[PDB]
Amino acid sequence: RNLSALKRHRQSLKRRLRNKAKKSAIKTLSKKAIQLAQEGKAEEALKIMRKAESLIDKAAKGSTLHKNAAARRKSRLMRKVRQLLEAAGAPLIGGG
Amino acid sequence: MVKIRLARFGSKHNPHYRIVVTDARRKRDGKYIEKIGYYDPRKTTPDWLKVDVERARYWLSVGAQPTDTARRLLRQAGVFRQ
Amino acid sequence: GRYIGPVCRLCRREGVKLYLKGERCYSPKCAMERRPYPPGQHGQKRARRPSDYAVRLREKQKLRRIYGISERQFRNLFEEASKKKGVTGSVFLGLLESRLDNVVYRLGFAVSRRQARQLVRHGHITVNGRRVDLPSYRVRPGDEIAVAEKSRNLELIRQNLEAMKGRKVGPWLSLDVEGMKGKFLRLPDREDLALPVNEQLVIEFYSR
Amino acid sequence: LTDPIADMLTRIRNATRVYKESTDVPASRFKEEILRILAREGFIKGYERVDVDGKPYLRVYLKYGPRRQGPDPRPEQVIHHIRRISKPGRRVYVGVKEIPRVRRGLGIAILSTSKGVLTDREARKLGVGGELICEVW
């Protein structure tokens, strides 16, 4: 009337927890970076973008983001940010 | 992983294995990649074993894993002779 | 299994002597030599022209009733001969001949195939050494058909070997008397046997 | 006219049923190649390029059997049978290995191939297939 599959279920709930926690912070920071990048604030834009970029690849180390997802996410982050800064500018740090 | 093992043919109380390379996740008598020899445990014929030792070493080279009771039939067939 | 019944009624229907008994066949107490007419209430009534079908039924039944064999195994052999290369008639006749119970009766080990079966069936026969009790075994060229020594010292085999001193046995067969052992040399050509059967008509029976 | 080739074969077939010495068909460099095979294989005495009212024709000299005994003194044919295989309605193509033996060997299948007009025999010889023109015996 029970197995260790119940055990396997329990583990999933904790990993989901840790997963959601990282992915939200990414989206929160990525947009935060994008936010600043429009109203640049060129230094602050690049400053945040690094912390997002970091959290992206650090989530990629685990089961959070697949290698290509992190790469996919980062490619879209930088591209949006830089072109946001191409209006006004200019990129105060790195980068880059 | 990719493996080299025995897929039973023959019939009831009439064993007859084919040594073969196929996915470990396959069903044992399932579709295989390539046959590389045969074997008769009941020894009812002059050559109840034979192995393409040339081929059996190719897969082994690339990461195929033999069963324990296949390693026997591969050593005896002189694949492990250095 | 096989026919296992009154065997003289067969010959009387066939209009031919089928030598199915051994000894009695040659005596004037034979069924045919006393009554050459069909078994039953109407055997003396004047026969009407047998249909095309009737003719081919008889010839097949004849060739089959000779070997005391079941219609299935008869059919299956014919089919095997129907697939196999060459003149179907020859291969069929040869295959019918290559049966162990027949080879046993041919080399004269027995008086009748009917008796030749029980000899095979009761282990009294062997081939190339090993014992065989299977009346259907497919005799090949090179097969050494012998009596088992544990059956060598028996009356019925002796009496029947005591007749096989000088009787000649077909161009496809050899024999060592006293030692109670012979050999199958080759597959009988149609010439080798003169069976009262137009075997062409047998093919034509099955082509319906 | 819709099938020039068939018309010829029909002109021949019809003409032989009344045992004409010859008969005329409208000319073509392809009808000739066929007629060539027809003559060499011995179906016709031969042909020659004539003109009718200034228009090109092929005259075909017909070959028959000997005078015969009985109520019907009409001789046998040399061409008993000739008819289209491939048609405009349906193009019949055969590879070499599937080329039919006309009348167990006694007749020929004229064929148009990428190596000229050949018979069944010649096709297996040259080793090529093609559109099956007609069968004749």
């Binding site: - | - | - | 309605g89 349906r90 193009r91 019949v92 193509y93």
Partner: protein, 99 residues
């Protein structure tokens, strides 16, 4: 190899995309006779260079949109409106096949 077909552009009413009608022959499996069958492909034309009536080649490609799995290879011929007519008239006839 990536499959390449030749066909006539029968519509240029889309943006950056044309309809390429490709025809083909084959003997009928039972009846022998050579029969014609055609099929329309929507092809990607990034520059909108191709016109109505152009006989062109298309190569099978990575998906561009839905229904778009071919890019235009090269111009083969220009100005075959005679073929577009053959296509168009058949469509027009369909309004006389209803009830």
């Amino acid at each position: 190899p990536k499959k390449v077909l030749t066909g006539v552009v029968v519509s240029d009413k889309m943006q950056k995309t044309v309809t390429v009608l490709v025809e083909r022959q084959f003997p009928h499996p039972l009846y022998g006779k050579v029969i014609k069958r055609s099929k329309k492909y929507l092809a990607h034309d990034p520059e909108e260079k191709y016109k109505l009536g152009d006989v062109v080649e298309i190569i099978e490609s990575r998906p561009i949109s839905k229904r778009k799995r071919f890019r235009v290879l090269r111009l083969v011929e220009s100005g075959r409106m005679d073929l577009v007519e053959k296509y168009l008239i058949r469509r027009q006839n369909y309004e006389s096949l209803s009830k």
